[PDB]
Amino acid sequence: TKWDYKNKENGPHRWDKLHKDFEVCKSGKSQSPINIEHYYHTQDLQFKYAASKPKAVFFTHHTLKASFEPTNHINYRGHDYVLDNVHFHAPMEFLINNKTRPLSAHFVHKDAKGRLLVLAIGFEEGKENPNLDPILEGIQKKQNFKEVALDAFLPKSINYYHFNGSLTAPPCTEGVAWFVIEEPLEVSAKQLAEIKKRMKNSPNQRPVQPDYNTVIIKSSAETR
Amino acid sequence: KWDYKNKENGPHRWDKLHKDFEVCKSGKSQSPINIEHYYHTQDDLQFKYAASKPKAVFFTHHTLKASFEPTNHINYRGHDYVLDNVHFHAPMEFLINNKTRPLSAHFVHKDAKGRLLVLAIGFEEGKENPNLDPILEGKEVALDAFLPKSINYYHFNGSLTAPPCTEGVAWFVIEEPLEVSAKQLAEIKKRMKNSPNQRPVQPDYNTVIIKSSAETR
Numbered sequence: 001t002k003w004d005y006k007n008k009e010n011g012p013h014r015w016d017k018l019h020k021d022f023e024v025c026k027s028g029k030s031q032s033p034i035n036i037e038h039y040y041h042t043q044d045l046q047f048k049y050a051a052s053k054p055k056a057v058f059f060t061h062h063t064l065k066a067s068f069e070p071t072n073h074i075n076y077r078g079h080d081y082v083l084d085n086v087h088f089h090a091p092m093e094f095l096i097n098n099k100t101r102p103l104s105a106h107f108v109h110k111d112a113k114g115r116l117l118v119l120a121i122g123f124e125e126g127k128e129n130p131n132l133d134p135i136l137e138g139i140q141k142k143q144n145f146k147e148v149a150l151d152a153f154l155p156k157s158i159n160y161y162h163f164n165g166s167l168t169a170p171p172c173t174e175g176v177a178w179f180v181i182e183e184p185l186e187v188s189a190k191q192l193a194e195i196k197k198r199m200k201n202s203p204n205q206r207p208v209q210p211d212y213n214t215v216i217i218k219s220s221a222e223t224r
Numbered sequence: 225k226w227d228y229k230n231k232e233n234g235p236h237r238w239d240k241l242h243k244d245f246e247v248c249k250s251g252k253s254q255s256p257i258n259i260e261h262y263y264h265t266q267d268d269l270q271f272k273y274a275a276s277k278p279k280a281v282f283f284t285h286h287t288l289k290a291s292f293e294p295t296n297h298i299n300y301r302g303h304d305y306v307l308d309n310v311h312f313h314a315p316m317e318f319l320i321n322n323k324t325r326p327l328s329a330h331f332v333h334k335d336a337k338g339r340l341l342v343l344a345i346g347f348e349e350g351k352e353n354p355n356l357d358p359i360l361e362g363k364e365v366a367l368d369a370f371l372p373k374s375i376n377y378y379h380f381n382g383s384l385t386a387p388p389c390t391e392g393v394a395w396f397v398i399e400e401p402l403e404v405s406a407k408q409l410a411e412i413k414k415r416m417k418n419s420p421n422q423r424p425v426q427p428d429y430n431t432v433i434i435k436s437s438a439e440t441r
């Protein structure tokens with residue numbers, strides 16, 4: 001009974017069935033991901049990202065993950081959150097106005113209390129991405145892992161939909177603070193393809209979930 | 225049987241009372257909460273309210289409740305939630321920027337998908353309020369008159385404030401208080417048996433709250 005995104009006995013349709021920890025995958029009223037169609041415009045969020053060497057780059061639970069030493073942070077409303085990892089989904093899991101991207105990255109953060117702030121940004125096919133370099137190369141070796149350009153990773157000025165949701169994979173824990181960033185980065189078709197290859201050419205995209213009038217704001221901030 | 229006392233059958237122990245109530249503890253979007261940080265917007269709510277005779281006016285589970293035939297609605301984002309009842313709380317369960325009110329009413333709605341939309345308004349002891357009377361003596365209720373013409377509200381995602389504490393509830397909490405007379409305040413509260421039915425503020429996992437304005441009529 002190991003969960004996956006395959007439409008068989010162990011898919012998303014049935015995560016709630018595989019363990020009793022996963023019940024909130026079906027019973028939960030703030031589940032991710034969803035379609036960002038309806039939101040509110042408006043006017044808080046501070047980025048402390050230094051280029052860092054991963055403490056490890058690996059395949060786990062259908063995703064490609066880079067973990068970090070807790071030297072990086074996000075500050076949202078005085079509360080502080082440290083970057084734990086960056087992992088990937090193909091295709092992108094959240095949908096902005098029913099538009100799909102081929103890939104997205106998730107910058108998971110935690111506070112000392114374990115509350116999560118997750119940061120989602122999407123990828124489209126095109127220009128080669130410098131910043132992917134140490135991850136594609138870091139995954140081939142357990143290495144003195146080369147640094148990732150975190151401060152340079154996502155746009156300086158950014159527009160996002162902030163809302164509360166859940167983890168997008170079991171155990172689908174809610175209370176998660178989602179910041180989904182409208183502007184996609186580009187990725188080489190080769191770059192994209194080996195990422196897909198390295199996630200075992202098998203998509204790790206949870207289906208959009210029942211939305212119970214989720215209150216979404218669209219806003220702006222600066223990430224440098 | 226659940227209560228609001230600081231003893232053994234209370235809010236800090238509601239989940240323990242049944243398995244269905246376990247979300248009361250484990251939930252990550254429980255209500256009430258204190259409305260302190262919020263976004264501002266300049267962008268959707270249509271009231272189809274009518275003076276309506278109550279199908280029943282009764283006390284259930286610590287509250288004063290008036291139920292209705294499914295003839296009143298609220299339109300939100302192209303869906304229509306129908307009104308089932310209004311009930312009261314003393315004191316007011318939700319807080320706005322830390323301010324407290326002696327009483328509140330909740331207007332409970334359901335859509336086609338069963339999704340909840342609940343409206344809360346605060347009261348302040350002042351002038352005799354006409355709209356309470358049809359309830360208090362129990363008369364049609366002037367739903368059309370009950371709420372201010374123009375409202376500033378807070379909107380967010382929470383839950384029922386009483387067992388089973390279900391989530392996915394679309395709260396609209398109106399800043400502008402209505403008035404109530406002390407003769408109304410005593411009588412209504414004593415119909416509530418001088419047991420304050422106000423659930424304590426729950427943990428707040430960074431609830432995304434918007435401030436907006438609307439016309440109720």
Ligand SMILES: [Cl-]
Pocket residue numbers: 089092093094104105120121
């Ligand atoms: Cl995503």
Ligand SMILES: [Cl-]
Pocket residue numbers: 313316317318328329344345
């Ligand atoms: Cl209230």
Ligand SMILES: [Zn+2]
Pocket residue numbers: 087088089106168
């Ligand atoms: Zn993810």
Ligand SMILES: [Zn+2]
Pocket residue numbers: 311312313330385
């Ligand atoms: Zn209530």
